[PDB]
């Protein structure tokens, strides 16, 4: 059901083209990235606090000392990526800020879609392709894909509307 | 199909390939018997 | 072989005869004109069901000339493999040789046919 | 001319990257 | 040998690391695992036989092991039809019985035998740091591996041969009499670009080349084994390499990842070592078979397949490759490097030949193209064959898809394992695999970057 | 209802449809629905279809057999919509096909004609399938109107009304 | 032919008893003196049962 | 404006099988036509009148009787190159 | 190439090259004045491409600008079957029958204009001057050929408008959907003029080779633009069946 | 079929065997 809703928003709303969704994608992917990179960095800058190869036993919940080197982590990322966190408080705030902000932005975009306020088209490219039949972009191709989805999915997805679309009116490319 | 003299143990043959999965699970069973020491 | 069994063999006898014909006709000519590209295409396409057929026939013959036709069939395939090597190595000399021996062993297979 | 706008915003982004790396606040142990 | 965290420093989920310096128990773990491998070979083969329908094609029955046996030329005749199921059954049973011997030996060495072989024998006792002995073990195994390659050679030359899909007069088991010994061809194969039209070693397309390769491989592997037994690692290798058990594991993991990717590509693209009569068409073959199937239909309906331009302006059935070769039209233009024993009869020096395409088509070629096109290696995870939008009535996923997908995944995860163990071996050799020492943290003695 | 009341009184089709206030017909045009706009289709709705100039009147489409066909209207969800015409008991009798190799219900094949009642085209009949298809596409959007697309260099994509913009901002 | 199935059933059941017995025998160090010859007996009998099945397959 | 195939659809080509423009699948409706007789008709096109579909060289008795029994399913319009060029009358891209 | 296999020419661009009469002779294919000669494997290799620029002025000469082919070694017609028919007056008639007789080619003109065209010899009927009794160096077949539309009637533009398929209007702009003259696609049948000047004849094998000059319109994009005039020069080869 | 019954019986035997070995080795103070 969720997958249907997702594809419906693609084909009817061009939701991937929506900047609000794009900010949401950036937030969720950046949240995953931050999770993976913090976890890995912390695990690989751990202080030698025990004799065993099992480094997990070398942490006390009440210990006052940091369990990993922030200076070593900072230098590593500064020399690998060019920049690095140097304030742990800012690092952990950023880990909250990014995904949360992404969810809020995507929600704003969805609120737009409630009213059919969609970033559906680039009118410049539609006007040009209307006038210039040699002109094609990935955007125009996605527009065509959406028209196909809508025509082929509407009768079964909205059975109450009694959409009778005879085979001859269904958009389709050659052969396929 | 198996040769006719072996068609008897056919239900046994159908359940043979899975056993190494049971070996992997048996590693965990033995660890749990020793308390994951 | 009973006429009714002779009929059952025809299923296989027909393609074999078509093959025997074209081998004597186009293949000889191809080898003569040194058309190795075409010689190779001929032994892999027109003759591309020769083994399934010759052996199917042999297996379906009476249990007396069965193995002999089997051994005869295998002989022809061996000569056709040397025709292919010769043709792939532009060796006109061995090509004619293998062609003749394939037809000889194909001739004997056909003699084992009721 | 929208091409000029696009190139300009992209260039601003890349130049910010350069300055943020080459001229960052130097992390110091205090 | 410690079997707990306090005595080894390794948790239960890293328990097999407790065997690193317990050569006897480690040997037991290895022999019992080998036993698992041989057990799967035998048991899965017997499963495939019990589930095998002899008349139905092998690739329609979810078989991946019987195709390997049939390629070796056991149990099959011309065009890959099954002559006798007994050889497949024999192969399965012999693996299944040997599995018990290896299981016993493994459980013995793992549980009862010496935990360390160093004391017992100088021959079997090894220290990871003892380069001479580790190279001895490399050598003994290289000689057995080369012997196995020569076993393949012997089967193909003196013991009934192997299935040659390219055989004249139709595919069949063939005895290889002239294997390619020419080192230029054999090693040229290694030097070919791994891109379309060349395919590196994936493009090996005749059993003579495959067999000549295995004579070279057997010879080089036997020579390298003897070299490694009679030599010691030289200075440059002693200086550029990490000499530890985990390091050698990581090296073998890198090698395994490389071989897994290679096997994936091999089964996906090559139809010589993986005959389509057992493995089904390659995806390139299925696409070309579609183009060919409708070439024949439309031609028989009276169309001019040569001069028929399609809606784009390119030829509907026939076009030219970017180097000018006459090829099949449509999206299949990408698979124009495809070679197949049912297609190659219709190819001329310039590519597809109009005279052949108009006069020399054969019903077996049309049937083969129809079968290969309808068995395109396309299918769902629950084995619904054909394109993903099709309905549920066709139970088929190509063996090529299964094998390629499986070995790509295994190759990738073994690349990950290589990185895991190679980085760990490096850190452990250097002494900071357990974390940063607080007193001598290196960054505290390094100047600021700015 | 207003048309049928006039018909029951005794008026003709052209007289009855002439009673329809253009303002009323204007409300029955999907371009004035607030669910047809776009997030970055800015400004007045006149910057889209244009300034409405006049109601063109009411099309009545008939096949060659005299069956009254209605163009199924564009729903709010669809940016594009196939042209379909159904008769009284809901059977598709005509359409504008995408593929004409195997088409069976084309306006051209089915001989659809359209006659207009009221508005600017009152008392005209169009039998040329080009213009019939044009008016069928017009009927998809509801009541048809002539627009002035020059005053605002209108681009031809619908905008949303102040209703839509207010709702968006406040939600 | 039923003697063949008898031999094969005996092989399968002795195989199960050995799958049970081998790991217990090798991991029971205090019972080792009693269980070494039993291990030898099981191995030899298993191999003989395999050979008997092998031959009977070739006799039926 | 209408393009040429749409205008063709306004004529008799839209009602019956057109001997000069209809693709080989449109002959499937006449029993015994697809594929051989439809192929021969499409191969010997164009035709000036429907009646002269009976004057195709090499036609046998069965095909002649079959054509005469279905003369009223046939119409003849000017050959439009928008339906014939590129062997579109055999494969217009419809499966 | 006569002795080259497929594996020897593949990936080398020798599949798009015209065969060449090796035996350098100036032979003559003798001809009876009332017979027909089949031509088996006709090949035309285009080597030069010229597109008539359209100056903004109406009295300036147009002139032919050379182009560079953007497509690769996919520019050759080959395996073409034809006939040579001899009139009672010594006229030779070339009548191309079928084969791989078209190739779409795209050339780039200086200034960045891409000009695709349907390079073809479809239905070519070329005639020489009356009075020939042999095929020699003087033979020059001159005639017209058909140039069908570069895009088929099944073609779909980026907004899915086509001729017998696709939309008939600009669906992205419902209010202005019938504004665009490009809503009507046509595929008019063009004409080319080809000359085959025969320069080398090998009478021992019936082979003819020469040079050709073609003149044809370019792609119009289903009528979206006026076609340019394209000039193609190259070499050809044929074998005459006697 | 009695086959689903035989397959499930063999599978149950095989499933119980390994845990049974561990259980016997734990109950009898084996070298677990
Ligand atoms: C260590 C060095 C690493 C870097 C060194 C150089 C980088 C190489 C990386 C691979 C690049 C391949 C790109 C194109 C692949 C391709 O065209 O195709 C694949 C080719 C195979 O080539 C194909 O080979 C085929 C050979 O078949 C021919 O011959 C056959 C004979 O039976 C058949 O007849 C067949 O029909 C006929 O066409 C055809 O020629 C194809 O046209 C040709 O493309 O692979 C090959 O050559 C060799 C197989 C390479 C495996 C690479 C895939 C996986 C890469 C690692 C993944 C890492 C993921 C981890 C992330 C972290
Ligand atoms: C391929 C799989 C494999 C193999 C061969 C081994 C092998 C080994 N492991 Mg490892 N292990 C594995 C997977 C494997 N492990 C997995 C997946 C885990 C995670 C759960 C572990 C976790 C682990 C830990 C935590 C430890 C080991 C240890 C050991 C070694 C000592 C075993 C011992 O004393 O157990 C005793 C167990 C038993 C006595 C229970 C019975 C076991 C037998 C073998 C069952 C066999 C049944 C079989 C059907 C019989 C067939 C008989 C006949 C037909 C041939 C041994 C060499 C130990 C070690 O390093 O020692 C220093 C150790 O501490 N392993
Ligand atoms: C190289 C390995 C390989 C390959 C290619 C195949 C392929 C096949 N097998 Mg076989 N099989 C294998 C191993 C393999 N098998 C093993 C090890 C066993 C023992 C359990 C079996 C037991 C077996 C049986 C009993 C049967 C098959 C069948 C089949 C066929 C259908 C498969 C299917 O529906 O899967 C469904 C797909 C899945 C279940 C997906 C599995 C997903 C895995 C678990 C993901 C793991 C990936 C990764 C490594 C995870 C690591 C995580 C960590 C590293 C981060 C197919 C030909 C069937 C058939 O047709 O037989 C004739 C059948 O009945 N197989
Ligand atoms: C990689 C496999 C491998 C390796 C390296 C070893 C190594 C060793 N084993 Mg072990 N073992 C294995 C497998 C292995 N075993 C298996 C599978 C079994 C089950 C049958 C056993 C059962 C076993 C027992 C019961 C004992 C040993 C012992 C020993 C030690 C002395 C061996 C000996 O007598 O000298 C050398 C022996 C020979 C030269 C003759 C044997 C060679 C074999 C039997 C013939 C060739 C192998 C094969 C059939 C041919 C190729 C294999 C094929 C897969 C290609 C040595 C550490 C003994 C020990 O611990 O002593 C303290 C001991 O008591 N092993
Ligand atoms: C599994 C087989 C195996 C293994 C593990 C080893 C292991 C070893 N060999 Mg041996 N060798 C083998 C087989 C094997 N050999 C065989 C079969 C032969 C016969 C030809 C030899 C002949 C041989 C010689 C003559 C020498 C060794 C040496 C060595 C040692 C260092 C080699 C090294 O640094 O490699 C890493 C390789 C390099 C550093 C070379 C650089 C190559 C560049 C990076 C290109 C690499 C290609 C690219 C990355 C991969 C492309 C993929 C594709 C080609 C598969 C090491 C102990 C050396 C030694 O110390 O002798 C005792 C030595 O001099 N080997
Ligand atoms: C032949 C290959 C090989 C060998 C011998 C080893 C050996 C070792 N590894 Mg390595 N490893 C390998 C490959 C290999 N690894 C690969 C390919 C990867 C990448 C995924 C890793 C990743 C890895 C990590 C991350 C670590 C090791 C560690 C270790 C050590 C302890 C392992 C242990 O006790 O596991 C115990 C076994 C288990 C806990 C069972 C794992 C269960 C997995 C999730 C199931 C995988 C899917 C499986 C196919 C089942 C799917 C079916 C499903 C439907 C149920 C040991 C030296 C540890 C180490 O460094 O110690 C020094 C360690 O932390 N390995
Ligand atoms: C609730 C507030 C509200 C509403 C509903 C409207 C509604 C309307 N106005 Mg008015 N307007 C407003 C406030 C409002 N206005 C204000 C405050 C001003 C002063 C700037 C104006 C100035 C103004 C003018 C000058 C004009 C209008 C016009 C219009 C009409 C067209 C609207 C349009 O095209 O929007 C377009 C809206 C958008 C494209 C939405 C922009 C969304 C922004 C860019 C998203 C950015 C968010 C942020 C950057 C992302 C977060 C990042 C994260 C890290 C935090 C419509 C009736 C036009 C009209 O027709 O007048 C007759 C006109 O010409 N308005
Ligand atoms: C300094 C202070 C302010 C600096 C201004 C810098 C901001 C520039 C950024 C652009 C913002 C909007 C421009 C869009 C394009 C444009 O030019 O529009 C141009 C349009 C005007 O539109 C014009 O209108 C004309 C009619 O008068 C014609 O119709 C023209 O065709 C048409 O272009 O501007 C507006 O409509 C602005 C008013 C915005 C209305 C707000 C709607 C609801 C608010 C929702 C907010 C969402 C919050 C996000 C959540 C986080
Ligand atoms: C071939 C053959 C054979 C063999 C077999 C065998 C070899 C066996 C094995 C066996 C086995 C090998 C088994 C085992 C199993 C296992 C199991 C069954 C387990 C399970 C698991 C689980 C259940 C888990 C759980 C858990 C744990 C424990 C840990 C933690 C977590 C949890 C809680 C979850 C026989 C004899 C039959 C005969 C015939 C033939
Ligand atoms: C390929 C063969 C590579 C041989 C390279 C080393 C030759 C071996 C000679 O012996 C080696 O000499 C190198 C010099 O490089 C020394 O360093 C080592 O101590 C020694 O092991
Ligand atoms: C080192 C940093 C600088 C980067 C390197 C600079 C080289 C890149 C050259 C592009 C610069 C602009 O130069 C020129 O731009 C025009 C504008 O579209 C291009 O013109 C192209 O597109 C336009 C419109 O799309 C067409 O009318 C024209 O026929 C076509 O060729 C030219 O192809 C390009 O040569
Ligand atoms: Ca079964
Ligand atoms: Ca039709
Ligand atoms: Fe943290």
* E386 SS3 class: coil
The ligand that comes nearest to the alpha carbon of residue E288 is 1
Number of Cβ atoms within 10 Å of the Cβ of A153: 16
Buried residues in G1-17 as b, exposed as e (16+ CB within 10 A):
eeebbebbeebeebeee
Task: Answer yes or no: are the C-beta atoms of C53 and C69 closer than 8 Å.
Answer: no
Question: By C-alpha distance, which of E87, B5, E101, E88 is closest to G53?
Answer: B5
How far is CA E346 from its chain centroid?
30
Which residues sit opposite I43 in a β-bridge?
Answer: I237
Asked if E422 and E415 touch (Cβ cutoff 8 Å), the reply is no
> DSSP string of C41-73?
HHHHTTTTTHHHHHHHHHHHS-TTTHHHHHHHH
Q: Name the one residue in this structure whose structure tokens are 């062609």.
A: C99
Please state, in angstroms and rounded to a whole number, the distance separating the CA atoms of residues H51 and H67. 9
Which runs of consecutive H residues, i.e. helices, occur in E200-244?
207-230, 235-240
CA-proximal residue: ligand 5, atom 12 (nearest): E224
Q: What separation, in Å, do the N-terminal and C-terminal C-alpha atoms of chain B show? A: 47
Helix (H/G/I), strand (E/B), else coil: E436: strand
The C-alpha atoms of residue I101 and residue C25 are separated, in whole angstroms, by: 32
A84 near D CB under 8 A: yes
Instruction: In whole angstroms, give the CA distance from residue F13 to residue F117.
Output: 6
Helix and strand counts by DSSP (H, E) for chain A: 6, 0
Domain range summary for chain G, segments of one domain joined by + = 1-60
Q: Which ligand is nearest the CA of E138, by number?
A: 5
Report how far residue G10's alpha carbon sits from residue G52's, in angstroms, rounded to the nearest whole number: 11
Shortest-distance Cα residue to atom 63 of ligand 3: E62
A 10 A CB-CB count for A122 gives 16
Query: Which distant-in-sequence residues (6+ apart) come within 8 Å of C99 by Cβ?
Result: C23, C27, C28, C31, C79, C83
CB E342 within 8 A of CB E362: no
Q: Across the interface, which of A48, A71, A75 has its CB nearest the CB of E435? A: A48
State the residue for tokens 């991991």.
G27
Q: Is F123 left (phi over 0), alpha (psi -120 to 50) or beta?
A: left
Alpha-carbon gap, residue F116 to F109, rounded angstroms: 21
Contact H39 E301 (CB under 8 A): yes
- Whether residues E350 and I103 touch (CB distance < 8 A) is answered with no
User: What token pair was written down for E238?
Assistant: 């002693």
Q: Is E162 helix (H, G, I), strand (E, B) or coil?
A: strand
List own/partner pairs for D15-19 with CB under 8 A and 24 or more apart.
Answer: D17/A82
Partner residues linked to I14 by β-bridges:
none
Q: Rounded to an integer, what distance in angstroms lies between the CA atom of residue H77 and that of residue H10? A: 12
Q: Which residues partner with I192 through β-bridges?
A: I145
Q: Would you say C110 and C73 are in contact if contact means Cβ atoms under 8 Å apart?
A: no
> CA–CA separation, E375 vs E248, rounded Å?
43
CA distance C69 to C85: 25
Is the distance from CB of F147 to CB of I175 less than 8 angstroms? yes
Query: Is the Cβ–Cβ distance between I48 and I236 less than 8 Å?
Result: no
Task: Give the residue carrying structure tokens 């530890």.
Answer: E244
Q: Is the CB of I112 under 6 A from ligand 11?
A: yes
Alpha carbon J21 to its chain's center: 8
d(CA C110, CA C114): 9
Query: What is the token pair recorded at A134?
Result: 């040699």
Q: Tokens for E376, please give them.
A: 């395109």
| Helix H61-68 / helix H36-44 crossing angle, nearest 10 deg | 80
Whole-angstrom distance, CA of residue E76 vs CA of residue E62: 18
Question: Tokens 């099309």 identify what position?
Answer: F59
A21 belongs to an annotated ligand binding site: yes
Residue G43 to residue H1: CA distance in whole angstroms: 92
| E273: its two tokens | 């070592």
Q: What is the Cα–Cα distance from G20 to J18, expressed in whole angstroms?
A: 8
Compute the distance between CA of residue E231 and CA of residue A5 in angstroms, rounded to an integer.
Answer: 67
According to DSSP, the residues that pair with E309 across neighbouring strands are E315
- Of C58, C39, C73, C52, the closest CA to residue E368 belongs to C52
In this structure, are strands H17-18 and H74-75 parallel, antiparallel, or unpaired?
parallel
Q: At what angle do helices A138-157 and A2-13 cross, to 10 degrees?
A: 130
Cβ within 8 Å of residue F125, ≥6 positions away: F113, F114, F115, F116
Confirm if E127 and E118 have CB atoms less than 8 A apart: yes
Q: How many angstroms does the Cα of residue E287 sit away from the middle of ligand 1?
A: 19
Q: Does residue J30 sit at the G interface (CB-CB below 8 Å)?
A: yes
F95 with F29: CB under 8 angstroms? no
Segment holding B17, helix H or strand E: none
Calpha distance C102→G39 (Å, rounded): 62
Helix or strand run (H / E) with residue E328? strand E326-328
**What is the spatial distance between Cα A50 and Cα H50, in angstroms, rounded to a whole number?**
99
Q: Contact at 8 Å (CB) between C47 and C19?
A: yes
User: Which string of b and e fits F111-133 if b means at least 16 CB within 10 Å?
Assistant: bbbbbbbbbebbeeebeebbebb
Experimental structure resolution, Å: 2.0
Give the 3-state DSSP-derived string for A42-101, with helices as H, strands as E and coil as C. Answer: HHHCEECCCCCCCHHHHCCCCCCCCCECHHHHHHHHHHHCCCCCCCHHHHHHHHHHHHHH
A12 alpha carbon, distance to own chain's centre: 19
For residue I196, list its beta bridge partners: I141, I212
Span from the CA of E122 to the centroid of ligand 4 (angstroms): 15
Residue F59 CB partners (closer than 8 Å, separation 6+)? F114, F115, F116, F135, F136, F138, F139, F144
Nearest CA in chain D to E449: D26
**Alpha carbon distance H94, J2 (integer Å):** 51
How many whole angstroms from its chain centre is CA I204? 28
Place of tokens 């839209």: H14
d(CA F17, CA F12): 8
- SS3 per residue for chain I: CCCCCHHHHCCCCCCCCCCCCCCCCCCCEECCCCCEEEEEEEEEEEEEEEEECCCCCCCCCCCEEECEECCCCCCCEEEEEEEEEECCCCCEEEEEEEEECEEEEEEEECCCEEEEEEEECCCCEEECCCCCCEECCCCEEEEEEEECCCCCCCCCCCCCECCCEEECCCCCCHHHCCCCHHHCCCCCCEEEEEEEEEEEEECCCCEEEEEEEEEEECCCCCCCCCCCEEEEEEEEEEEECC
User: Using CB atoms within 10 A of its CB, is residue E391 exposed (0-12), middle (13-18) or buried (19+)?
Assistant: exposed
Q: How far is CA E400 from CA E282, E403, E407, in A?
A: 7, 5, 11
SS3 of chain F = CHHHHHHHHCCCHHHHHHCCCHHHHHHCEHHHCCCCCECCCCCCHHHCCCEEEEECCEEEEECCCCCEEEECCCCCCCCCCCCEEECCCCCEEEECCCECCCCCCEHHHHCCEEEEECCCCCCCEECCHHHHHHHHHHHHCECCEEEECCCCCCCCCCCCCHHHHHHHHHC
Nearest to E113 by CA among E122, E104, E100: E104
Pocket test for ligand 10, best of E135, E230, E236, E240 (most atoms within 8 A of CB): E236
Cβ neighbours of C100 (radius 10 Å): 13
SS3 assignment, position H60: coil
Please state, as a whole number, how many other Cβ atoms lie within 10 Å of the Cβ of residue E446.
11
State whether residue E301 is helix, strand or coil: coil
* Annotated domain spans of chain H: 1-85
DSSP structural state of residue E379: B
Nearest to E343 by CA among E330, E326, E331: E326
Using CB atoms within 10 A of its CB, is residue I87 exposed (0-12), middle (13-18) or buried (19+)?
middle
Task: Compute CA distances J11 → B13, E97, J4, J18, whole Å.
Answer: 10, 20, 10, 12
Q: How many CB pairs lie under 8 A apart between chains B and G? A: 13
H46 preceded by a cis bond (ω within 30 of 0) = yes
Length of chain E: 450
Task: Please give the DSSP secondary-structure letter assigned to residue H51.
Answer: G
Q: Work out the burial of residue E33: count CB atoms within 10 Å of its CB; fewer than 13 is exposed, 13-18 middle, 19 or more buried.
A: middle
Task: Please enumerate in sequence order all residues whose Cβ is within 8 A of that of E62, keeping only pairs 6 or more positions apart, or say none.
Answer: E48, E51, E383, E397, E399, E402
DSSP state of E302: T
Q: Is J15 on the interface with G (CB under 8 A)?
A: no
Instruction: Burial-class residue C67 by CB neighbours within 10 Å (0-12, 13-18, 19+).
Output: exposed
| Cβ neighbours around I225 below 10 Å, total | 14
What whole-number distance in Å separates Cα of residue I11 and Cα of residue I14?
Answer: 8
Q: Give the residues across from F125 on adjacent strands.
A: F115
* Residue I177 exposure: Cα atoms within 13 Å on the Cβ side: 25
Nearest by CB: G19 against J17, J28, J32: J17
Element (H, E) at H17: strand H17-18
- Does the beta-carbon distance from E43 to B16 stay under 8 Å? yes
Q: Max CA-CA distance within chain J?
A: 43
What I60-65 contacts at long range (C-beta under 8 Å, 24+ apart), as own/partner pairs, is I62/I229, I64/I231, I65/I109, I65/I110
Q: What angle do CA F80, F82, F88 make, to 5 degrees?
A: 135
What is the phi/psi pair of residue A86, to 5°? -125, -10
Distances from the Cα of J32 to the Cα of E102, E116, G19, angstroms: 21, 19, 16
Alpha helices in E51-167 (DSSP H): 66-71, 86-107, 117-120, 131-158
In chain B, count H helices and then E strands: 2, 0
| Whether E362 and C45 lie within 8 Å, measured CB to CB | yes
Beta bridge partners of I211: I197, I235
Cα distance between residue E285 and residue E391, in whole Å: 24
Q: Do G57 and B5 touch (CB under 8 A)?
A: yes
Give exposure, I62-77, as e/b (b: 16+ Cβ within 10 Å).
eeebebeeeeebbbbb
Mutual angle of helices E363-374 and E283-300, in 10-degree steps:
130
Calculated CA dihedral for residues I71, I76, I80, I84, nearest 10 degrees: 130
Is the CB of F168 within 6 Å of ligand 8?
yes
Nearest residue to I5 (alpha-carbon basis) of E344, F153, C97: E344
Q: Which residue numbers come right before each break in chain C (C to N over 2.5 Å)?
A: none
Alpha-carbon separation of residue J15 from B23, E211, I235, J8 (angstroms): 10, 44, 79, 10
């Amino acid at each position: 059901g969720i997958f249907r809703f997702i594809l419906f928003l693609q084909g009817f709303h061009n939701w991937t083209l929506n900047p609000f969704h794009m900010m949401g994608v950036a937030g969720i992917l950046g949240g995953a990235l931050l999770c993976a990179i913090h976890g890995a960095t912390v695990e690989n800058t751990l202080f030698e606090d025990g004799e065993d190869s099992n480094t997990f036993r070398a942490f006390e919940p009440t210990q006052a000392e940091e369990t990993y080197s922030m200076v070593t982590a900072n230098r590593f990322w500064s020399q690998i990526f060019g920049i690095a966190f140097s304030n742990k408080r800012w690092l952990h705030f950023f880990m909250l800020f990014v995904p949360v902000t992404g969810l809020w932005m995507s929600s704003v975009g969805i609120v737009g879609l409630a009213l059919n306020l969609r970033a559906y088209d680039f009118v410049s490219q539609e006007l040009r392709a209307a006038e210039d039949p040699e002109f094609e972009t990935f955007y125009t191709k996605n527009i065509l894909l959406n028209e196909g989805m809508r025509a082929w999915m509407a009768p079964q997805d909205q059975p109450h509307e009694n959409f009778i679309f005879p085979e001859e009116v269904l958009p389709r490319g050659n052969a396929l | 199909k198996l040769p006719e003299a072996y068609q008897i143990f056919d239900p046994l043959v159908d359940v043979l390939p899975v056993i190494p999965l049971f070996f992997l699970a048996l590693a965990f069973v033995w660890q749990a018997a020793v308390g994951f020491k | 072989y009973s006429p009714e069994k002779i009929a059952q063999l025809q299923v296989y006898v027909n393609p074999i005869a078509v093959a025997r014909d074209g081998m004597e006709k186009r293949l000889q000519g191809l080898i003569a004109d040194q058309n190795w590209v075409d010689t190779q295409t001929y032994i892999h396409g027109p003759l591309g069901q020769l083994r399934r057929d010759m052996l199917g026939l042999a297996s379906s013959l009476l249990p007396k000339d069965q193995d002999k036709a089997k051994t005869l069939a295998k002989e022809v395939f061996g000569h056709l493999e040397r025709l292919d090597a010769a043709a792939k190595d532009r060796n006109g000399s061995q090509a004619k040789i293998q062609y003749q021996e394939a037809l000889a062993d194909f001739d004997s297979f056909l003699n084992l046919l009721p | 001319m929208e091409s000029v706008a696009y190139i300009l915003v992209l260039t601003m982004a890349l130049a910010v990257l350069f300055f943020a790396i080459a001229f960052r606040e130097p992390p110091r142990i205090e | 040998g410690g079997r707990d965290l306090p005595s080894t420093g390794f948790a239960w989920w890293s328990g097999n690391a407790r065997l690193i310096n317990l050569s006897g128990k480690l040997l037991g773990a290895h022999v019992a695992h080998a036993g698992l491998i041989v057990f799967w070979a035998g048991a899965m083969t017997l499963f495939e036989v019990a589930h095998f329908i002899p008349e139905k094609p092998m690739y329609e029955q979810g078989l991946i092991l019987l195709p390997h046996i049939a390629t070796l030329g056991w149990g099959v005749g011309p065009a890959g039809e099954v002559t006798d199921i007994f050889p497949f059954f024999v192969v399965g049973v012999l693996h299944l019985i040997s599995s018990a011997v290896l299981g016993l030996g493994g459980i013995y060495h793992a549980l009862r035998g010496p935990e360390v072989l160093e004391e017992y024998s100088s021959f079997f006792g090894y220290d990871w740091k003892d380069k001479n002995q580790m190279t001895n073990i490399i050598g003994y195994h290289l000689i057995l591996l080369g012997c196995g390659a020569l076993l393949l050679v012997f089967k193909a030359m003196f013991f009934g041969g192997v299935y040659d899909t390219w055989a004249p007069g139709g595919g069949d088991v063939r005895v290889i009499t002239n294997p390619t010994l020419n080192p230029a061809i054999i090693f040229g194969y290694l030097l070919k670009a791994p891109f379309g039209g060349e395919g590196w070693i994936i493009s090996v397309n005749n059993m003579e080349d495959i067999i000549g390769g295995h004579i070279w491989i057997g010879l080089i592997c036997i020579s390298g084994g003897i070299w490694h037994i009679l030599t010691k690692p030289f200075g440059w290798a002693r200086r550029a390499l990490i000499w530890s058990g985990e390091a050698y594991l990581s090296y073998s993991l890198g090698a395994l990842s490389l071989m897994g990717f290679i096997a994936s590509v091999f089964v996906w693209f090559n139809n010589t070592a993986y005959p389509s009569e057992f493995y089904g068409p390659t995806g390139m073959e299925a696409s070309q078979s579609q183009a060919f199937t409708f070439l024949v239909r439309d031609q028989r309906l009276g169309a001019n397949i040569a001069s028929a331009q399609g809606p784009t302006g390119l030829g509907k059935y026939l076009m030219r490759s970017p180097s000018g070769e006459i090829i099949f039209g449509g999206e299949t233009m990408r698979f124009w490097d495809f070679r197949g024993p049912w297609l190659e009869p219709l190819r001329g020096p310039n590519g597809l030949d109009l005279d052949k395409l108009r006069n020399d088509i054969q019903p077996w070629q049309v049937r083969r193209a129809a079968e290969y096109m309808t068995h395109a290696p396309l299918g769902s995870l629950n084995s619904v064959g054909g394109v993903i939008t099709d309905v549920n009535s066709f139970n088929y996923v190509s063996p090529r898809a299964w094998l390629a997908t499986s070995h790509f995944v295994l190759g990738f995860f073994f690349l990950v394992g290589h990185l895991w163990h190679a980085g760990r071996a490096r850190a452990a050799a250097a002494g900071f695999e357990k974390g940063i020492d607080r007193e001598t943290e290196p960054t505290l003695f390094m100047p600021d970057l700015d | 209802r207003r048309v049928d009341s006039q018909l029951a009184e005794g008026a003709s089709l052209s007289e009855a449809w002439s009673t329809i206030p253009e303002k009323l017909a204007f409300y029955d045009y999907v371009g004035n629905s607030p669910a047809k706009g776009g997030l970055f289709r800015t400004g007045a709705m006149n910057s889209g279809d244009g300034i409405a100039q006049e109601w063109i009147g009411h099309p009545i489409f008939k096949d060659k057999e005299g069956r009254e066909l209605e163009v199924r209207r564009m729903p709010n969800f669809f940016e594009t919509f196939p042209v379909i015409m159904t008769d009284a008991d809901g059977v598709v009798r005509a359409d504008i096909p995408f593929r004409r190799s195997e088409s069976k219900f084309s306006v051209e094949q089915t001989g659809v004609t359209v006659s207009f009642y009221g508005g600017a085209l009152d008392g005209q009949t169009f039998s040329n399938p080009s213009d019939v298809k044009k008016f069928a596409r017009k009927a998809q959007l509801g009541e048809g109107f002539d627009f002035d697309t020059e005053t605002f260099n209108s681009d031809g994509v619908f905008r949303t009304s102040p209703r839509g913009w207010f709702t968006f901002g406040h939600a | 032919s039923i003697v063949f199935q008898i031999a094969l059933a005996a092989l399968v059941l002795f195989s199960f008893v050995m799958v049970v017995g081998v790991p217990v025998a090798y991991a029971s160090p205090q019972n080792w003196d009693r269980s070494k010859p039993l291990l030898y007996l099981g191995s030899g009998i298993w191999a003989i049962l395999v050979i008997v099945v092998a031959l009977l397959n070739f006799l039926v | 404006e209408l393009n040429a195939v749409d205008a063709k659809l306004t004529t008799d080509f839209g009602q019956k099988i057109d001997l000069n423009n209809s693709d080989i699948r449109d002959f499937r409706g006449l029993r015994g036509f697809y594929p051989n007789l439809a192929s021969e008709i499409i191969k010997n096109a164009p035709y000036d009148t429907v009646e002269e579909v009976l004057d195709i060289p090499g036609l046998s008795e069965t095909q002649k009787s079959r054509l005469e029994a279905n003369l009223g399913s046939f119409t003849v319009t000017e050959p439009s190159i928008e339906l014939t060029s590129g062997d579109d009358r055999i494969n217009p891209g419809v499966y | 190439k006569s002795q080259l296999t497929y594996d020897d020419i593949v990936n080398t661009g020798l599949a798009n090259v015209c065969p060449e009469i090796s035996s350098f002779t100036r032979g003559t294919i003798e001809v009876e004045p009332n017979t027909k000669y089949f031509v088996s494997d006709f090949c035309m290799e285009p080597q030069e491409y010229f597109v008539k620029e359209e100056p903004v002025n109406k009295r300036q000469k147009a002139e032919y600008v050379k182009g560079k082919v953007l497509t690769r070694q996919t520019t050759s017609l080959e395996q073409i079957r034809g006939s040579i028919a001899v009139g009672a007056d010594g006229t030779l008639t070339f009548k191309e029958k079928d084969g791989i007789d078209f190739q779409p080619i795209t050339v780039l003109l200086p200034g960045g204009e891409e000009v695709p065209f349907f390079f073809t010899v479809k239905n070519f009927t070329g005639t020489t001057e009356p009075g020939f009794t042999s095929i020699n160096s003087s033979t020059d077949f001159v005639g017209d050929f058909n140039v069908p539309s570069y895009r088929g009637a099944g073609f779909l533009d980026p907004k899915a408008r086509g001729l017998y398929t696709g939309y008939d209007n600009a669906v992205a702009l419902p209010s202005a959907a019938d504004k665009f003259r490009t809503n009507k696609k046509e595929t008019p049948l063009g004409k080319g003029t080809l000359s085959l000047q025969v320069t080398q004849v090998d009478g021992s094998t019936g082979e003819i080779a020469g040079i050709f000059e073609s003149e044809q319109p370019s792609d119009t994009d289903l009528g979206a633009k006026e076609p340019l005039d394209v000039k193609v020069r190259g070499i050809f080869y044929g074998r005459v069946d006697t | 079929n009695l086959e689903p019954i035989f397959q499930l019986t063999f599978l149950g035997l095989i499933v119980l065997a390994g845990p049974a070995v561990v259980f016997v080795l734990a109950f009898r103070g084996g070298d677990l």
